[PDB]
From a paper:
Co-crystallisation studies revealed the binding mode of this chemical series within the NgFabI catalytic pocket as a ternary complex involving the FabI active site, the NADH co-factor and the inhibitor. Key increases in potency were achieved by expanding the right-hand side lactam to a diazepanone, from which the extra nitrogen provided an additional interaction with the enzyme via H-bonding to the carbonyl of A199 (compound 1; IC50 6 nM). Inserting a stereochemically defined methyl group on this diazepanone resulted in supplemental Van der Waals interactions with the lipophilic environment of the active site (compound 2; IC50 2.4 nM) while its enantiomer was 5-fold less potent (compound 6; IC50 14 nM). The introduction of a hydroxyl group in a suitable orientation to this right-hand side reinforced the interaction with the NADH co-factor via a conserved water bridging network (compound 7; IC50 1.9 nM; water bridging network similar to that shown in Fig. 2a). Finally, bringing together the stereochemically defined methyl and hydroxyl groups enhanced potency, resulting in Debio 1453 (IC50 0.6 nM). Interestingly, Debio 1453 also interacts with the NADH co-factor via Van der Waals contacts between its benzofuran methyl and the reduced form of nicotinamide, and via a H-bond between its central carbonyl and the ribose hydroxyl of NADH. These multiple points of interaction between Debio 1453 and both the enzyme and its co-factor may account for its sub-nanomolar NgFabI potency. The NgFabI co-structures described here achieved resolution of 1.3 Å, higher than those reported previously for S. aureus FabI (1.8 Å)21 or E. coli FabI (1.5 to 2.7 Å), which provided sufficient detail to leverage the interactions of the right-hand side hydroxyl substituent with a precisely defined conserved water network binding to the co-factor NADH phosphate, thereby reinforcing non-mutable interactions and increasing potency.
Inhibition of FabI, which is an enoyl-acyl carrier protein (ACP) reductase that catalyses the essential rate-limiting step in fatty acid biosynthesis in some bacterial species, is an effective antimicrobial approach for various Gram-positive and Gram-negative bacterial pathogens. Importantly, FabI is essential for the growth of N. gonorrhoeae and its chemical inhibition cannot be overcome by the addition of exogenous fatty acids in vitro, underscoring FabI as an attractive and yet untapped antibacterial target for the treatment of gonorrhoea. In the current report, structure-based drug design using novel N. gonorrhoeae FabI inhibitor co-crystals guides medicinal chemistry toward increasing potency in the sub-nanomolar range and drives the discovery of Debio 1453.
Author numbering:
A (entry chain B): 4 to 260
B (entry chain A): 4 to 261
The structure:
C-alpha cells in the first residue's frame, strides 16, 4: 500500500463511528503503522482494544487543553519511533448549549474560548509539539474541518468560528513548516453520523438535505474521508500543502437546489 | 495499485515533459490500462511511441476544435473497450500574441474565442462525448487548471478568463453527472516547464518567484501532479466531486511575501 513505512499518530478515535476510525482503518489498509491518543482515562480500555485490532499497542492519554499532556505524548512516542511521518487532528468540541438555537443567544465568552482552544488552537499546539519528530521526514499533518468555516449554518454557531480559525491555522502551519519538510492540509467532510451528532436535534434532517442536494445524491462515509486522509498523509500528495479538500460529495459547490 | 484494471483515456501527452505524461506514468504505476489522443497527424508517431512505452497501442487523433473528431475518438475506442473508467483533460491553448504584454492591448475577439473553445469548452465537450462509455461505472474525469482562473496574473491574460470558464465547467459537469456515477474534478497546478512554457518569455523568472515564495520553497513536478490525478481518478476519491485541488506547493495560499 502507499503508506508502507509511514508511522502515523491519530487523535480523536473514540468509537468505530469516529471519522478518526475511518482514517485509521484506511491508513492501516495502505500499510501504515499507527499510534493513538485518547482524551480521558475513562476511555483507555476501549481505545486500546480498537488500536489492537489495527495492530497497534501505542496509545497515549492526551487532553489538548494541557500543554504538558501534549508534550508528554511526543516524549513517550519518541521512545518507540525514530520520527513521526503523519499526524491526524480529528478533535472538535464546543459546549453543547452553544450548538443549539439562535447564534447570539447561545454564545458566551467561556463557550467561545473553549470551542476555539480545543477545536482550533489544538492544531498549532500539536504541530509545534510534534515538530522535532516530524521535521526533515517529508511528513504530513491532516486536520478535519467543516463547511461552517466558510458558510453560516443553523445551530453550528460558535463551532463555525472555531473551524474558520482552524482552517487559517492549517494555512499558517503549512507556511511555517513547509521549508523543513512538513505539509499541513485539511479535509472539510460532509456530515456524518458519529458521536458528534449526539444531542444535535434533527441531524437526520441535515443528512437528508445533503443527500438530496449534492451532486452524488448521497452522504459520504468515514471510509471516503479516511481514504482522502491516507492520500494526504502519503508521498503521493507531496505537491499539496495548505489545502482544504472537500469530501462532501460536491455539496459545497451546488446552489439553488 | 489502486487503479488496477481501470481503463483511462488521456489527452494532451506530447512529450515526456507534458503534465499528461506525468499523469500517464502515475496511472500506469497504479495498474491502469491507458489510451491516448493527439491533436494533429504530425504528432501521431511520437505519441504512439510514448504510448507503447506505457503499454498501450490505443492512440487516436483528436483536435478539440472538431466535434466530428471528438466523437470519433469514442466510436473508435469503443471497438476495444466496453466502457471507460477515466478521462484526463490536459489541453490548453491561446494564440501566443494574446499571452504577452498588456491584457487589453493583447486581447482580441478571435483570440478570446479560440482560447475559450480549446481550453474551456473542450471539457464539457469531451465529458459529453464520453458519457455513454463512462455511465454507471463509478468513473472519473480530471482536468488541469491554473491560478489565473481566480487571480489576475501578468501576461497570462485571456487564458485566465478561459481557465475560470473551465473551473465553472468542472463544477457544472460534476453536478450534471454525479447521479450517474461519474465524478469530475480539477487540479490547479503550479507552473511547470513544459512545451507550454516555450515561447513564454521569462518563464524561468516565474519559476524562481514561485520557489522563493511558496510554503515548500520549490516548484512542483509532473509526478506530483500525476499522482494527484491518479488519486482523483481512483475510487479512493469517491467522496470528492466538483473540486479544484491545488498542486502548487501551497503557492496560492501565501501573501505579503517580501
Ligand atoms: N461528524 C461530522 O459530521 C463531521 C463533519 C466534518 C467535520 N467533523 C470534525 O471531525 C472531527 C472528528 O469528529 P467526529 O465526528 O469523528 O466525532 P467524534 O466525537 O467521534 O470525535 C471527536 C473527538 O474529539 C475528541 N476530543 C474532544 N475534546 C477533546 C480534548 N479536550 N482533547 C482531546 N480530544 C478531544 C473526542 O474525545 C473525540 O475523540 C472533529 O473536528 C469534527 O468537528 C465532523
Ligand atoms: N505548464 C504549466 O505551468 C501549467 C500549470 C497549470 C496548468 N497547466 C495546464 O496543463 C495542461 C497541459 O499543458 P502542459 O503544460 O502539459 O503543456 P503541453 O504543451 O505538454 O500540453 C498541452 C497540450 O494541449 C494540446 N492541445 C492544444 N491545442 C489542442 C487542440 N486544439 N486539440 C487537442 N489538444 C490540443 C497540445 O497538443 C498539448 O498536448 C493545459 O491545460 C495547461 O493550461 C499548465
Ligand atoms: C453538521 C453538524 C455537526 C457535526 N460537525 C460537523 C462537527 O464539527 C461537530 C462538532 C461538535 C462539537 N462539540 C460537540 C458536539 C459536536 N456534539 C456533542 C453534543 C458533544 O457531546 C458536545 O458536547 N459538543 O455538528 C453540528 C452541530 C450543529 C449543527 C450542525 C452540525
Ligand atoms: C504559468 C504560465 C503558463 C503555463 N500555463 C499555466 C498555461 O496554462 C499555458 C497555456 C498556454 C496556452 N497557449 C499557448 C501557450 C501556453 N504557449 C505556447 C506559446 C504555445 O505554443 C501557444 O501557441 N500558446 O503560461 C503562461 C503564459 C503567460 C504567463 C504565465 C504563464
Amino acid at each position: 500500500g502507499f503508506l508502507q513505512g509511514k508511522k502515523i499518530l491519530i487523535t480523536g478515535m473514540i468509537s468505530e463511528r469516529s471519522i478518526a476510525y475511518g482514517i485509521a482503518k484506511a491508513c492501516r489498509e495502505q500499510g501504515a503503522e499507527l499510534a493513538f491518543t485518547y482524551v480521558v482515562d475513562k476511555l483507555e480500555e476501549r481505545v486500546r482494544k480498537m488500536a489492537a485490532e489495527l495492530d497497534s499497542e501505542l496509545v497515549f492519554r492526551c487532553d489538548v487543553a494541557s500543554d504538558d499532556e501534549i508534550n508528554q505524548v511526543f516524549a513517550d512516542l519518541g521512545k518507540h519511533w525514530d520520527g513521526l511521518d503523519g499526524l491526524v487532528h480529528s478533535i472538535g468540541f464546543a459546549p453543547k448549549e452553544a450548538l443549539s438555537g439562535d447564534f447570539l443567544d447561545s454564545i458566551s465568552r467561556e463557550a467561545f474560548n473553549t470551542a476555539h482552544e480545543i477545536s482550533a488552537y489544538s492544531l498549532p499546539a500539536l504541530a509545534k509539539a510534534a515538530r522535532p519528530m516530524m521535521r526533515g521526514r517529508n511528513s504530513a499533518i491532516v486536520a478535519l474541518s467543516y463547511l461552517g468555516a466558510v458558510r453560516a449554518i443553523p445551530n453550528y454557531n460558535v463551532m463555525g468560528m472555531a473551524k474558520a480559525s482552524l482552517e487559517a491555522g492549517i494555512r499558517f502551519t503549512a507556511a511555517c513548516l513547509g521549508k523543513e519538510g512538513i505539509r499541513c492540509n485539511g479535509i472539510s467532510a460532509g456530515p456524518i453520523k458519529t458521536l458528534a451528532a449526539s444531542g444535535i436535534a434533527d441531524f437526520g434532517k441535515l443528512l437528508g438535505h445533503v443527500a438530496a442536494h449534492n451532486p452524488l445524491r448521497r452522504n459520504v462515509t468515514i471510509e471516503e474521508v479516511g481514504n482522502t486522509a491516507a492520500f494526504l498523509l502519503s508521498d503521493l500528495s507531496s505537491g499539496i500543502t495548505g489545502e482544504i479538500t472537500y469530501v462532501d460529495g460536491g455539496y459545497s459547490i451546488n446552489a439553488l437546489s
